[PDB]
Amino acid sequence: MMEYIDGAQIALYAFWLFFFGLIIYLRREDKREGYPLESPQGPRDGWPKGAPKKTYVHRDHG
């Protein structure tokens, strides 16, 4: 009985909340290299703060 609110609109805002969540996650992943930034005012992290640098386990011998 809500006239303006309809399921297609509800779905679309559900997607927007997921999508803006996804962009945040990807921008955290993008900062695992090269961060924190150098600046004349000291280190800078940008936003969001980056995920930490990964360490990779090599194949033990072969």
Binding site: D6, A8, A11, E29, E33, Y56
Partner: protein, 336 residues
């Protein structure tokens, strides 16, 4: 004139061709490796042995029978004429059931073969998913590929569920090259212009973004391939100047960058979201919204244009038509 890395002048060959490393049970590698000179000039040269297992073998049997039913119905529809089967091929169709059957089983010629081909094709696609999933596990890899493929299967399945939700198999996609494009156009006509479906618009943005990203990423890796940038796993585990320069190019160009790993996450999501937002847009169509342009008028998407015509009140009554009904099932004489 500077070497563009688009073509390889000098290939090398190994007398042995590499095999599969591990987990040979419940299935085995067919064939053996051979080299293609043309494929070796586009990219890597070995045309390989191949893996099926139980799921792969069954997938091919189901999928062969599906394709065989489609082709034999196409060929029957030109009266078995093999010249017309080739000449008319892109116009030929195996066509869904008639609308008045709803979800009931239809007659064999009138869509009963269609539903049977659609069932075997669907099972074949699911078994092929199981194959890919099992093979990723057996190679000790992440499951990123089967979830990417699941997103495509999701869109495909909406061409079953949306006909189910509107209550008639007649709304399904005909198997045929031009016929399924006729369906695609008519679907947008029936539901009042799919451009105003916002999940269709999202799906397009991700389809275009996938082309943007693979153009950008493909060009980026070729621009640093002179420095080993194409050895991406090595650049991810042991960042070289090739990774540093590709990060700096995009940072200096557009103000932010990815990493050599995380660019592949951007790629993965843009591809996956194309078919996922697409599927949602189909499932909403005819179930929640029946005229997307009018939904766009309601929600403020539709740009105003000056009127091209104005109806008088009696024309508003005269120019309404009828909804389309059944075809006439007789050949009237007009003799009296």
């Amino acid at each position: 004139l500077e070497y563009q890395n688009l073509f390889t002048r000098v290939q090398v060959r190994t007398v042995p061709e590499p095999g599969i490393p591990i987990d040979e049970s419940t299935g085995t590698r067919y064939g053996t490796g051979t080299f293609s000179y043309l494929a070796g000039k586009f990219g890597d040269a070995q045309i390989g042995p191949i893996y099926l297992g139980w799921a792969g073998v069954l997938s091919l049997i189901f999928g062969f029978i599906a394709i065989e039913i489609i082709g034999l119905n196409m060929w029957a529809s030109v009266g078995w004429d093999p010249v017309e089967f080739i000449r008319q091929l892109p116009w030929l169709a195996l066509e869904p059931p008639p609308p008045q059957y709803g979800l009931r089983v239809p007659p064999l010629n009138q869509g009963g073969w269609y539903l049977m081909a659609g069932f075997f094709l669907t099972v074949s696609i699911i078994l092929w998913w199981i194959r890919i999933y099992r093979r990723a596990r057996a190679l000790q890899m992440g499951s990123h590929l089967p979830w990417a493929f699941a997103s495509a299967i999701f869109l495909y399945s909406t061409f079953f569920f949306q006909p189910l939700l509107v209550g008639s198999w007649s709304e399904m996609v005909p198997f045929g090259i031009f016929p399924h494009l006729d369906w695609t156009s008519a679907f947008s006509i029936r539901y009042g212009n799919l451009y105003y479906n916002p999940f269709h618009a999202l799906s397009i943005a991700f389809l275009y973004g996938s082309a943007v990203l693979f153009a950008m990423h493909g060009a980026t890796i070729l621009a640093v391939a002179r420095m080993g940038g194409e050895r991406e796993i090595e650049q991810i585990t042991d960042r070289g100047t090739a990774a540093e320069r590709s990060m700096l190019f995009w940072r200096w160009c557009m103000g932010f960058n990815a990493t050599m790993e995380s660019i592949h996450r951007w790629a993965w999501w843009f591809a996956v979201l194309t078919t996922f937002t697409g599927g949602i847009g189909i499932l909403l169509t005819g179930t929640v919204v029946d005229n997307w342009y009018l939904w766009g008028v309601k929600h403020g998407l539709v740009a105003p244009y000056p009127a091209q015509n104005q109806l008088t009140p009696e024309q508003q009554d005269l120019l309404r038509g009828r909804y389309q009904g059944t075809a006439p099932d007789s050949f009237p004489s007009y003799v009296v």
